[PDB]
Ligand binder design. Structure first.
Ligand SMILES: *[C@@H]1O[C@H](CO)[C@@H](O[C@@H]2O[C@H](CO)[C@@H](O[C@@H]3O[C@H](CO)[C@@H](O)[C@H](O)[C@@H]3O)[C@H](O)[C@H]2NC(C)=O)[C@H](O)[C@H]1NC(C)=O
Ligand SMILES: *[C@@H]1O[C@H](CO)[C@@H](O[C@@H]2O[C@H](CO)[C@@H](O[C@@H]3O[C@H](CO)[C@@H](O)[C@H](O)[C@@H]3O)[C@H](O)[C@H]2NC(C)=O)[C@H](O)[C@H]1NC(C)=O
Ligand SMILES: *[C@@H]1O[C@H](CO)[C@@H](O[C@@H]2O[C@H](CO)[C@@H](O[C@@H]3O[C@H](CO)[C@@H](O)[C@H](O)[C@@H]3O)[C@H](O)[C@H]2NC(C)=O)[C@H](O)[C@H]1NC(C)=O
Ligand SMILES: *[C@@H]1O[C@H](CO)[C@@H](O)[C@H](O)[C@H]1NC(C)=O
Ligand SMILES: *[C@@H]1O[C@H](CO)[C@@H](O)[C@H](O)[C@H]1NC(C)=O
Ligand SMILES: *[C@@H]1O[C@H](CO)[C@@H](O)[C@H](O)[C@H]1NC(C)=O
Ligand SMILES: *[C@@H]1O[C@H](CO)[C@@H](O)[C@H](O)[C@H]1NC(C)=O
Lengths: 872, 78
């Protein structure tokens, strides 16, 4: 039919018809036989995939004839017409090299039974002329010849060792000279571990963390920073465990990776949700988003899922990786400039990334493809440490000549040679995923001077090293406009409302942190003496009436606070939403994806303003369709009209040669023009409509290690096996599962199931057998929890919060009035005998929520005469 | 690979390559040149077949080569 049909059935190309990647039933005669007729799928003409010329291969005991035969070496020049071209006789090479007139070669001509050939001395590459030998640049061409640095020599190479590395007498090897002995540092799900390099000693640096996926040390101060994604905090601690604190706790929707700078004394971390790389001092005083949007200057590569970081202060470049649709390993200068891509080919899931400071080689690991590669810092010559046999590596660090990587599927730490991946040794296996890894050693952070030097190089807030490891650029916090003065910079204090500005202008804290019982500003202007007593708890907005409302509800186009300052004109004037939150006319904030989502999500309905959606300028990396909705570029030219209108599917271009599935990962489905990835194949889901992904799962194989095969021919990671979840529908994963051993901070139920140690007497019977909730009076409790009189544990934060989390309500009745005025309820709420601050609307509201909050207010509302009482 | 008299396995390409590839130099040792073409030596019953070193013989079908490597004796196929 026509192009307006916008639908196609199963073509089922059989003999002559051959549906290409764009599903075009072109003739079978077009297979490179002078016929590039199918420009649509482009499969009819292939530059090298269709040009093979595979004649030359034949057994070495056979001399290939010029006619194409493979006359035997014994039959070579056997005085018999063995071939049509008679290459055996026609070709009888006699002392061609001995003849000086012909076969003149550079180093060493080697004769044969037919014609001649030549060989070059070691370190000299033979030229295409087959007579000229050219010296090999072993330092760049084959960097694995030398450990650490190298110098090119004519016909050979000289290896050296960086300072601190003692060169071994054997040569081409280096050995450390530091006083300290290096030991691996990696983070489990709840534990920071301490493992020696040889794997002889195992330890536990710190436990009791929700979910740690990243860590990085600081040689200067002997600190150890990490990220708790579940808790959304960036915390640091001394190696001796003397002090622990939360550096950053605000605006961390998801922090995949972290990299501590040990030169400019800065902290960098990637944010997957906000899609940007941030910078802050080791105390988190000043924050600034350094990079955002796309990185290729063409919008092909953009921050989608950045989960790797590696600092090289010697050149001031911070390499990072992204496992989105368009995987890239691009780098940025530490000052936030020179944003550029490095490696963008043969890459699906670059989870891990590191920089070998010894020889300046950028190492990265791919999860789906399963390889580990190293290249120059400009990403020119890619060499594979491993072919891809690794099931699913996540983190990678290099020390001396050994590369240490942590693999999720095998749930273990493995090490090998940094160049050829030899001596692959499994150090220790962990019950949980191994996550980020590092090698703690003074050499891992080489000493290099700070261009800032002092006073942040005379910068007001931030001093970031310029690219190339020379000079610095002044910066400003996120809430400051960076003006470039004459030979200097000025940070405009321009800040939105609902955000206090310190008198010293050090930072722009939120308004609800002004006079919050804490001197948030270093000056302390926020906690002015002349300020009303704030009865509301920290992290809450206090209205003039004294009621407490959530800061998220501030200026939410709804008069939540009775006093009215919630929607006050001055407080909502110049209100700015989050970076990913698209502001509406009524100042209500909605996610940027909802800007023209075709849904009246915002009360003012500005999210469906035709005028603004027609004139909607969209961030790079997302495709704009007719409706004005901006789906991601990966959602453009897909079989599914994600935008709804077929404008998101330029079927002319979608069937054209522009959209061809990547050979490495993107698997083309024959019936449509879909380009689902390789790991999307046989995922048990109809990822592409024709179900071609799920057709060959019986023929499809699994990874030899770190993969479990189910009865449905489903390959799943070995870690997912016996996880208590049916990863494969046939329950083969959970068919036979001996209970696993519980870790240090895991309590073992009588059901032989491991639960977090914090959940004993959780007051929610998390374990099925309810064995966790026993002996609570004899259990004391954890240091960070308050114990109810009944004996159960509760968060110390939830104490005296107006919420009786304890059943006996002891968590609230053991504290005085929330304010010295003489009452417990700040927002005119109802306080029962248990001192629970039942909301004023919730006062005498249907069921008796409070333990002793039974109300005789039948006059206001008799219990029997209640709508809530659906069932007598 | 052509097995050397010393026990090596000098390559066929290296056979008679004018190089001392083996201790016995079997490659350069008595390079087989038209030994079958010479009627004085390599006299075989049916068909002498030359090689890069010395010679050998082949018999017509139905005739088994004798231990002498020069006499072909009819096979008793029955
Ligand atoms: C992680 O584990 C490693 C290995 O246990 C720890 O490094 C070790 O630290 C101890 C205590 O400082 C060192 O003992 C020292 O021995 C020397 C003599 O060899 C002695 O002069 C010192 O006074 C001290 O007793 C041990 O040698 C050292 N080993 C290594 C591998 O360097 C590391 O401190 C642990 N880190 C954390 C944060 O848990
Ligand atoms: C655990 O290890 C860390 C890192 O080595 C220790 O932090 C640093 O410890 C040193 C020695 O106590 C501190 O030096 C002292 O500084 C004060 C001034 O702040 C000075 O008056 C003292 O004479 C001495 O020079 C250093 O300040 C401290 N870190 C920083 C940068 O503040 C930590 O103390 C160790 N904890 C223990 C006791 O295991
Ligand atoms: C900003 O980043 C870009 C991209 O990384 C830098 O450009 C790069 O500069 C290096 C050093 O000159 C180049 O390496 C050289 O490449 C050539 C082959 O092109 C090779 O023969 C040399 O031995 C060396 O490896 C690299 O190719 C080049 N890359 C690109 C894409 O331009 C730039 O220098 C950085 N500095 C700035 C301008 O901020
Ligand atoms: C190459 O030729 C030189 C000069 O004749 C000689 O010294 C050297 O041993 C030869 N090497 C090889 C590989 O034959
Ligand atoms: C990059 O940008 C150019 C225009 O400057 C465009 O023609 C091209 O298609 C874009 N994609 C590539 C090849 O990176
Ligand atoms: C680690 O691997 C070894 C060798 O397969 C095995 O004996 C040991 O039980 C494993 N440990 C864990 C915790 O799975
Ligand atoms: C063997 O020798 C006979 C007699 O000269 C000749 O007719 C025949 O063609 C030869 N066959 C071979 C395989 O040389």
């Amino acid at each position: 039919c026509g192009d307006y049909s916008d639908e196609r059935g199963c073509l089922y190309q059989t003999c002559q018809q051959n549906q290409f990647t764009c599903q075009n039933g072109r003739c079978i005669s077009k297979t490179f036989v002078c016929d590039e007729d199918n420009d649509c799928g482009d499969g009819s003409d292939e530059l090298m995939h269709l040009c093979h010329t595979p004649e030359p291969t034949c057994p070495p005991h056979e001399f290939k004839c010029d006619n194409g035969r493979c006359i035997e070496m014994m039959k070579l020049c056997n005085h018999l017409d063995d071939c049509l071209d008679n290459s055996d006789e026609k070709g009888c090479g006699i002392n061609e090299c001995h003849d000086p007139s012909i076969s003149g070669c550079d180093h060493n001509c080697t004769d044969t039974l037919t014609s001649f050939y030549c060989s070059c001395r070691p370190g000299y590459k033979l030229m295409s002329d087959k007579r000229t030998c050219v010296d090999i640049d072993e330092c760049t061409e084959m960097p694995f010849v030398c450990s650490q640095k190298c110098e090119n020599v004519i016909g050979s190479y000289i290896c050296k060792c960086a300072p601190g590395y003692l060169r071994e007498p054997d040569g081409k090897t280096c050995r450390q000279n530091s006083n300290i002995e290096p030991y691996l540092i990696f983070s489990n799900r709840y534990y920071l571990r301490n493992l020696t390099i040889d794997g002889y000693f195992y330890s536990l640096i710190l436990e009791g963390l929700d979910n740690v996926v990243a860590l990085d040390f600081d040689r200067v101060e002997k600190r150890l920073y990490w990220i708790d994604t579940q808790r959304q905090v960036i915390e640091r601690m001394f190696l001796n465990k003397t002090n622990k604190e939360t550096i950053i706790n605000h605006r961390l929707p998801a922090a995949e990776s972290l990299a501590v700078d040990w030169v400019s004394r800065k902290l960098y971390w990637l944010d997957a949700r906000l899609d940007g790389l941030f910078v802050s001092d080791l105390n988190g005083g000043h924050r600034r988003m350094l990079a955002q949007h796309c990185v290729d200057a063409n919008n092909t590569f953009c921050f989608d899922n950045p989960r790797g970081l590696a600092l090289h202060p010697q050149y001031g470049y911070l390499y990072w990786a992204d496992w989105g649709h368009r995987a890239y390993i691009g780098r940025v200068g530490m000052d936030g400039t020179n944003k550029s891509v490095i490696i963008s080919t043969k890459l699906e899931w670059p989870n891990g990334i590191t920089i070998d400071y010894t020889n300046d080689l950028l190492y990265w690991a791919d999860a789906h493809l399963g390889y580990i590669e190293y290249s120059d810092l400009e990403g020119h010559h890619r060499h594979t440490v491993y072919d891809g046999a690794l099931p699913h590596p996540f983190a990678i660090t290099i020390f001396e000549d050994t590369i240490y990587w942590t693999d999720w599927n095998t749930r273990t730490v493995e090490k090998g040679n940094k160049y050829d991946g030899s001596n692959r040794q499994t150090l220790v296996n962990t019950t949980h995923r191994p996550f980020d890894i590092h090698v703690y050693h003074p050499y891992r952070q080489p000493i290099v001077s700070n261009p800032c030097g002092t006073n942040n190089g005379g910068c007001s807030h931030l001093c970031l090293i310029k690219p190339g490891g020379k000079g610095f650029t002044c910066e400003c916090p996120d809430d400051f406009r960076t003006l470039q003065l004459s030979g200097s910079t000025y940070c405009m204090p321009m800040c939105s409302s609902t955000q206090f500005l310190c008198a010293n202008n050090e930072k722009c804290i939120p308004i609800w942190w002004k006079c919050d019982g804490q001197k948030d500003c270093s000056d302390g202007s926020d906690e002015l003496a002349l300020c009303p007593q704030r009865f509301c708890r920290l992290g809450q907005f206090q209205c003039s009436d004294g009621n407490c409302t959530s800061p998220q509800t501030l200026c939410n186009a709804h008069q939540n606070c009775p006093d009215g300052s919630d929607e006050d004109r001055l407080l909502c004037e110049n209100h700015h939403c989050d970076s990913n939150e698209w502001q509406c006319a009524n100042k209500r904030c909605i996610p940027e994806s909802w800007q023209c989502d075709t849904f009246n999500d915002c009360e003012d309905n500005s999210d469906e303003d035709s005028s603004h959606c027609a004139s909607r300028t969209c961030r790079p990396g997302q495709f704009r369709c007719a409706n004005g909705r901006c789906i991601p570029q990966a959602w453009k030219c897909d079989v599914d009209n994600d935008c709804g209108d077929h404008s998101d599917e330029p079927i002319e271009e979608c069937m054209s040669s522009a959209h061809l599935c990547d050979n490495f990962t993107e698997f083309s489905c024959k019936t449509n023009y879909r380009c689902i990835p390789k790991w999307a194949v046989c995922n048990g889901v109809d990822d592409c409509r024709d179900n071609s992904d799920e057709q060959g799962c019986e023929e499809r194989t699994c990874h030899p290690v770190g993969d479990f095969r189910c009865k449905n021919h489903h390959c799943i990671p070995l870690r997912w096996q016996c996880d208590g979840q049916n990863d494969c529908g046939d329950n083969s994963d959970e068919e036979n599962c001996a209970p696993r051993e519980c870790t240090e901070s895991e309590f073992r139920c009588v059901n032989q199931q491991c639960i977090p140690s914090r959940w004993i007497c959780d007051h929610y019977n998390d374990c099925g057998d309810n064995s966790d909730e026993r002996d609570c009076e004899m259990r004391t409790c954890h240091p960070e929890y308050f114990q109810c009189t009944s004996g159960h544990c509760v968060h110390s934060e939830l104490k005296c919060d107006g919420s009786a989390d304890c059943l006996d309500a002891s968590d609230e009745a053991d504290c005085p009035t929330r304010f010295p005025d003489g009452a417990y309820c700040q927002a005119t709420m109802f306080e029962c005998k248990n001192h629970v601050c039942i909301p004023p609307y919730w006062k005498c509201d249907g069921d008796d929520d409070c333990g002793d909050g039974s109300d005789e207010e039948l006059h206001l509302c008799l219990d029997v005469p209640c709508n809530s009482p659906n069932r007598f």
